């Protein structure tokens, strides 16, 4: 449970955990899809794909190393996993690919074979992964004409028109030092890694900063992707949430836990202590749903997602759910808040502490990049337990009560009523 981080030339961050069996090293950049443009959208996803290409991947495999990378909105990360002993051979492969081979990975035979893969990849996504496709579109309309609206995997149109020069252009503007953090998780010590790094000098484009832009903003709107040939209806709905490093980051995350997630087929799920289940189970209004409090640097999204085959009662699904959310402003109970506290701790635990160093790396790098440090799991619990009913009520009265929303859906959505109908349910009549 130690968050160690020191700066010499490069800001090095590590979180050691003795019993681990393995160790992971890599760099995480403070720039992701939210830094691209509508036309070069998909560059970051492309980088990730070449970094994992058959050529580069075969080199580290001989050495007994494994590769992993993830593209997000605010950040990007390249990671190399290894045994606790080869904690040095990872640092060689890292520098070899980001300085020496930052021109060998971009050959006219590799880039074309990779481009052909992300194209079949992103296409496959839009053709079949409906729930994620919808959540991606939710960000698209909620933050339109603003950074957060750009899909992480990029659009098929900005992708097929992307050239090697664009990769370089992006890389030379974001893969800088002042916008980077070298992460090390697994078992290796902070002082073990920091030495192998402060050994090899060379700055490589120092003093350079990435370009700036215009702040992200929420806009009440919707995008309806009707498709009557699909067998279900997938919809996502949300209000403007909380950004990371916000006084209410936790109240919000707790508020989502109150309604939580559900799966109509799993017996135990049907028994949960969520009032909403009394309303939706009578006529079986949906196969599943899940609330969330997504947070980013400039903004966030608080809402839920759901999938259903009861295409003639979608208005009741949406109506009941939004009536429950009304309660957070006027009648949420102590026991509901308490049930949430326990469950939030359990999930926040399983995330920050799993048996996989790669997840730890991403989380560590991402956090240190936005707030210059990581909040310890124990420090979180103290904040979570401190939340009162009054807090939830004040938060909801600001974020949920009579506030614009964003909607997105695909499939048999004829039954999803108009905007103003849904919008009206964000409140209740009173004397």
């Amino acid at each position: 449970a130690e968050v160690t981080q020191l700066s010499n030339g490069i800001v090095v961050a590590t979180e050691h955990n003795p019993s681990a069996h393995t160790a992971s090293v890599g760099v995480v950049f403070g720039s992701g899809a939210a830094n691209e443009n509508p036309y070069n959208n998909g560059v970051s996803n492309l980088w990730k794909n070449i970094f994992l290409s058959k050529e580069n991947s075969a080199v580290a495999a001989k050495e007994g190393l494994a590769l992993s990378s993830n593209i997000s909105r605010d950040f990007q990360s390249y990671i190399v996993s290894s045994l606790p002993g080869s904690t040095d051979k990872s640092l060689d492969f890292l520098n070899q690919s980001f300085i020496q081979q930052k021109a060998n990975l971009l050959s006219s035979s590799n880039f074309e074979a990779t481009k052909k893969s992300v194209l079949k990849q992103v296409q496959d996504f839009e053709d079949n992964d409906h729930p994620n496709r919808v959540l991606e579109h939710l960000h698209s309309t909620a933050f339109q004409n603003t950074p957060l609206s750009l899909p992480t995997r990029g659009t098929l149109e900005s992708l097929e028109n992307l050239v090697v020069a664009d990769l370089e252009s992006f890389a030379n503007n974001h893969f800088l030092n002042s916008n980077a953090v070298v992460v090390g998780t697994g078992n290796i010590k902070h002082e073990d890694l920091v030495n192998s790094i402060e050994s090899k000098n060379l700055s490589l484009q120092t003093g350079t900063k990435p370009v700036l832009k215009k702040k992200a903003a929420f806009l009440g709107s919707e995008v309806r992707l009707r498709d009557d040939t699909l067998p279900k209806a997938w919809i996502s709905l949300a209000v403007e949430g909380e950004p990371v490093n916000s006084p209410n980051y936790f109240v919000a995350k707790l508020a989502a836990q109150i309604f939580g997630s559900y799966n109509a087929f799993e017996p135990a799920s049907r028994l949960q202590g969520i009032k909403l289940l009394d309303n939706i189970q009578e006529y079986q209004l949906c196969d599943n749903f899940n609330h969330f409090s997504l947070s980013y640097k400039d903004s966030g999204l608080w809402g839920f997602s759901t999938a259903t085959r009861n295409v003639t009662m979608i208005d009741d699904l949406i109506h009941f759910t939004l009536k429950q959310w009304n309660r957070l402003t006027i009648s949420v109970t102590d026991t509901e808040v308490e049930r949430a506290k326990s469950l939030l701790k359990l999930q926040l635990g399983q995330l920050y502490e799993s048996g996989n160093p790669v997840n730890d790396a991403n989380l560590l790098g991402a956090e240190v990049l936005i707030k210059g440090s990581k909040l310890s799991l124990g420090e979180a619990f103290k904040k979570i337990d401190a939340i009162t009913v009054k807090d939830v009520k004040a938060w909801a009265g600001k974020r949920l009560w009579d506030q614009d929303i964003a909607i997105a859906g695909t499939g048999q959505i004829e039954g999803l009523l108009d905007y103003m109908r849904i919008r009206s349910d964000m409140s209740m009549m009173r004397w």
């Binding site: 007994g64 494994a66 045994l83 202590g273 049930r339 469950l343 359990l346």
Partner: protein
């Protein structure tokens, strides 16, 4: 009644009661399935509802998984609430109500949904076919329930009596203080369980070879090969699996999935080729079989197969570890084949 553990300064502990009751030991088709689904229902003192409402207020969940050999009752929770989940798991094993209405209202439905999900994924339709033809009645028993042969409430009770005993299970706690764990297991109802016999037979399963099965299916086509491994000859196959599923092998882009299922008395190697049209499936496999018949290895992935076999932190009780740094050559004797999908346009065992 082996009680293992392993402490740590983390806040999330995870109790788990492994039991030798999987499909491999199933007396009737899918009975193990039904029982895994019958877990956490009603006990004689606590209802499934109270159990959930309580654990939620504490901060923990339950789950019951079904392997080909095991039936695991896991429980994830906050550290200091250890005894509760020990007695909870204890209660399930010793006194689940088994009410006739719980079968018709919760169990059967949950089970019907399980079979449905699997009936739509062709690779699993294949994996099930491999086991059925290699081990004709041991590990080749149907994993899930489908109603081909009757299974009453009583049959589910009998199988519970056999499987749930002190001599057939093993408590295992991750992120738990062994001192307290052993103390609580003995202080619970675990020790009251009528310790019967252990069905873990050491004699190697009588496997077959050169067998093949073809199943017509509407969806993606899949061709797969199944190879029975030895108790000691499994460490080489493991590197093979990681070799074919890596950047080192040239034909990694020609196969969907490849793995080695490790048991306590041998194992099974599986290779999967999946694609939309039958033509690409027939080619990619006809190439794999040919290139493997002219085997090669040299163990360049000796450090990759060892690294990938370590990322499994839940398996800190795995069999042989250093058997890898030995053999480094692979051939391809007799194996088993299964065609699923566009049958009239798929290879036969012969032309392979």
């Amino acid at each position: 009644l082996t009680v293992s553990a392993r402490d740590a300064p983390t806040k999330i502990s995870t109790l788990a009661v492994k039991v030798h009751g999987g499909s491999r030991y199933a007396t009737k088709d899918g009975v193990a399935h039904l029982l895994n689904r019958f877990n956490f229902q009603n006990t004689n003192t606590r209802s499934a509802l109270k159990l959930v409402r309580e654990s939620e207020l504490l901060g923990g969940t339950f789950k019951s998984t079904l392997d080909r050999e095991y039936i695991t009752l896991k429980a994830t929770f906050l550290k200091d609430d250890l005894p509760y989940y020990v007695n909870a798991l204890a209660d399930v094993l010793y006194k689940t109500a088994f009410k006739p209405h719980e079968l018709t209202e919760s169990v059967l439905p949950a089970a019907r949904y399980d079979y449905a999900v699997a009936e739509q994924c062709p690779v699993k339709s294949a994996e099930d076919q491999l086991y059925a033809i290699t081990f004709r009645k041991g590990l080749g028993n149907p994993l899930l329930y489908d109603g081909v042969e009757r299974v009453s409430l009583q049959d589910i009770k009998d199988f519970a009596d056999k499987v749930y005993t002190k001599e057939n299970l093993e408590v295992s706690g991750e992120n738990v203080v062994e001192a307290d764990l052993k103390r609580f297991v003995d202080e619970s109802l675990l020790s009251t369980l009528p310790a019967g016999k252990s069905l873990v037979s050491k004699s190697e399963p009588k496997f077959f070879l050169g067998e093949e099965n073809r199943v017509r299916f509407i969806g993606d086509s899949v061709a797969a090969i199944g190879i029975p491994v030895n108790k000691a000859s499994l460490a080489q196959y493991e590197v093979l699996a990681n070799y074919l599923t890596s950047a080192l092998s040239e034909l990694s882009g020609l196969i969907s999935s490849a793995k080695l299922d490790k048991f306590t008395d041998g194992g099974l190697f599986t290779l999967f080729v999946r694609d939309q049209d039958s033509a690409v499936v027939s080619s990619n496999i006809k190439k794999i079989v040919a290139d493997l018949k002219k085997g090669k290895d040299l163990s360049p992935a000796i450090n990759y197969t060892k690294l990938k076999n370590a990322v499994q932190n839940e398996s800190v009780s795995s069999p042989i570890e250093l058997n890898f740094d030995a053999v480094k050559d692979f051939k391809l004797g007799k194996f088993n084949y299964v065609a699923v999908g566009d049958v009239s346009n798929l290879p036969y065992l012969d032309e392979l």
